[PDB]
């Protein structure tokens, strides 16, 4: 519309309705020029870290974390009152564009606003580009609305053959300029809308019943079983008579059951006390990567991280495994720490009702057929696939964690739910790409056909607004006694938690999940 | 609309109608960047000064004083001709926005206007934020229309537990960016409207009658009373006979009366002559805070300041108490003075008809039941609540004082009128918040997820207009002789009072209240 006319307004709120909540949040961004306006191929030959790909001049908006869209109070309203959550619609606006040219002269930089410069924006609706937005990486909106964030650079990997960097003829190059874009000056604004495909509600609740306890504790089964092959409490001694008996109440472990616990992939267990662990190197002949549970994909090890949902130790427990996500705590110098107390550990232990424990076996199975001569042998089940009549609970969604993921495009998928967390989507929210259009510097007066390298140094800033409509289930329980709630128990604090400190810094003190209200199997 | 098109006009006038006056005033403001765009928590552990809270990047418009909306002549038209005043409607405009970027280079600052920068403005209509606008503090429009004022920074306290700074889980953090705002460039303008809830007229008048004199001085009552228990003028001597008598005229003190004087909280009295006061420290073991009348709220002393309305010494009298408001006079160095003649003292003495004196007791009450053996004992009433059949007069509104206050949100309130002065409102005029939107400085070329600290230094200026509709009562008295008026008696002056001086400085020479015209009980 105009230079001196604002192209949008600031909107950040949540509005709660009967069956739905609509959260809006606005942020301020700054977009640098990446790679001097030019694509660059990436790669390194590493034993398991081997990768190859392309970094692009473009940058993109990552909307996928829950604290982008929710405050800590709104997250409390949600999880305390509701059994389920799923996203419905999404809407995005990019407005109040400002492009700034900078001038380095006489050892000092001055910034002026270039009014005729443009910025390019397109959302990829057809999913034609590699989708990196679900990778669980950085570059999303800040949790706190006053923060200004930097738009992350876009890049993508490609199929790696073995442990060697080198590309083959299968590798694709995608040129972002080969899509149609929208070019925006300071008067122009961008907008798009999106609809989520129907997806099961995330279950925000814990079970108040175990699987193996689903029976009536008063009654007996009409089913019989073999109690023992001999008299006495000692093995391989007795009168050698087979005793059959009815299954009476009080001895549930022998009840015949309709269902089974969920699948397992065992994890290696580590103690938070440093002296209580076996000494393992970070890198070398024996890596910690070797001793963790990994999968070999094309001669490349990769952790199973978290892996299939499995019950975990409590957040405060003195042991952890890779089945637990780890977030930085309130006070961290960054990139390293020697103490687990600085870290904030996730725990799935609420799902211990239906699911086997990450660091413990699924069960034990007979390895032979006994006879009078041969004693029975059983053995541990470390990894178990799904079986008919098996039930399991998904991993929990967190306030700091990802909302969705893109289901890979493949001829088969089983229970398409993301192992980090959230909502598997075949057509997730489309990636929105933005770059500063190049402005050439002063050209030569004669003609040359070499591409022009010299460019005016610029960056742009602006405002971005996101609106997601969510759909929620109200808890409908006949439970008498009070349910557990998410409360602030933090007590007497010199400086308020979940608020800026004396220096203005805002951090998130705790990891908070969605499962508080109980329900029954 | 446009860069080179003005978004509003200058309007300052009052327009008087039969039952109403509509005053408009326009000012020029300047808005700095506060706290480098970031919230900061505040607090200090003090014995009674203990506080905790948050200072915000935002700033706000304080419209609450009378001289914002009135000139000294308009204030004279009002109070001389009218018994009552109440506000009706209010309207606010913020226009002619100008955002200026500043550059410090080579030891000198240059200012340029950034045309694509925005400013954010929202009024809080739902009273969701802490309301600091009624606190009787600085940061309102200047009295004199040529002055340019600086928009005050916004901040708020929180519930303090005891004498300790530390917050508890009850303390709230409010993020202003979590409201919807309006973003304005130089072409854009802001506007809002507001309606006052029905409120009793402030009574601009003094009583021409005392309570205890409401009788007919000619007649006698038909009521009798006990005149004395003995003969003679000396106590505990006489003939010990009970004498009853009719209540004759001329001895009014014994008249039976339908009504009582207003409540009291006694104040400590101080003489303006320094030698005539008892020596008390400002701070130490014995504070002057201890010896003034205070209330203990959660182990924290606070003055009763002014407190319930009570008659006071005259403005020129040689003694004062905390029941009298104090304003700076025409000539003050600021923040301190050793002489009361520099200060301008408020006086409530007009209400001495219905109200007890601030430094004197409500009365005296019998402490025992006398008999022949025991002499009667009475004792002073320093503090008295309201009683059935009690009448009182509110504190006066001044030209320099607050217009309204927000009635706290609580399950009970008694006679909700602000003890400083003005109009108690449940939904007062909403606070209007304004800040400079951040413009990031030159970002790094690589990507980092830390929030961007570096910012372009900016400020904005503009114009703000306020229009309040007022409702007034015309005096309707049958009084014969002339009433007291507010006149300029200042006499021969080298430099005109109520006008700028030779140096351009404008001050307010006197404290002027609203009560001149008499009325009768």
Biggest sheet descriptor of chain A = 8 strands, mixed
Q: Given the helix and strand composition of chain A, which structural class is it?
A: mainly beta
Helix content of chain A: under 10%
The beta-strand count of chain A equals 30
Shape of chain A: elongated
Span between N and C termini of chain A? 58 Å
- Rounded Rg of chain A: 28 Å
Largest interface: A-B, 63 and 55 residues
Subunit arrangement of the protein: part of a larger assembly
Strand content of chain A: 25-35%
Number of helices, where a helix is a run of at least 4 consecutive DSSP H or I residues of chain A? 3
Subcellular location (chains A, B): Virion
Protein name (chains A, B): Capsid protein
GO molecular function (chains A, B): structural molecule activity
Keywords (chains A, B): Capsid protein, T=1 icosahedral capsid protein, Virion
How would you describe what is shown here?
This is part of a larger assembly, with 2 copies of chain A (521 residues). In chain A, 3% of the residues lie in helices and 30% in strands. In chain A, strands 1, 2, 5, 6, 8, 11, 12 and 29 form an 8-stranded mixed beta sheet that branches. Chain A has 521 residues and is mainly β. Chain A has 3 helices and 30 strands. Chain A has helices at residues 66-69, 72-81, 288-291, and strands at 13-16, 20-31, 40-44, 51-61, 82-105, 108-113, 119-123, 148-150, 153-157, 182-184, 190-195, 202-203, 206-207, 224-228, 243-246, 264-265, 270-271, 294-296, 301-303, 319-320, 326-328, 343-345, 363-366, 378-381, 383-384, 404-406, 423-425, 432-436, 458-474, 518-519. The relative contact order of chain A is 0.24. The N and C termini of chain A lie far apart (58 Å). It is classed as virus. Keywords: Icosahedral Capsid, AAV11, Adeno-associated virus, Parvovirus, Gene Therapy.
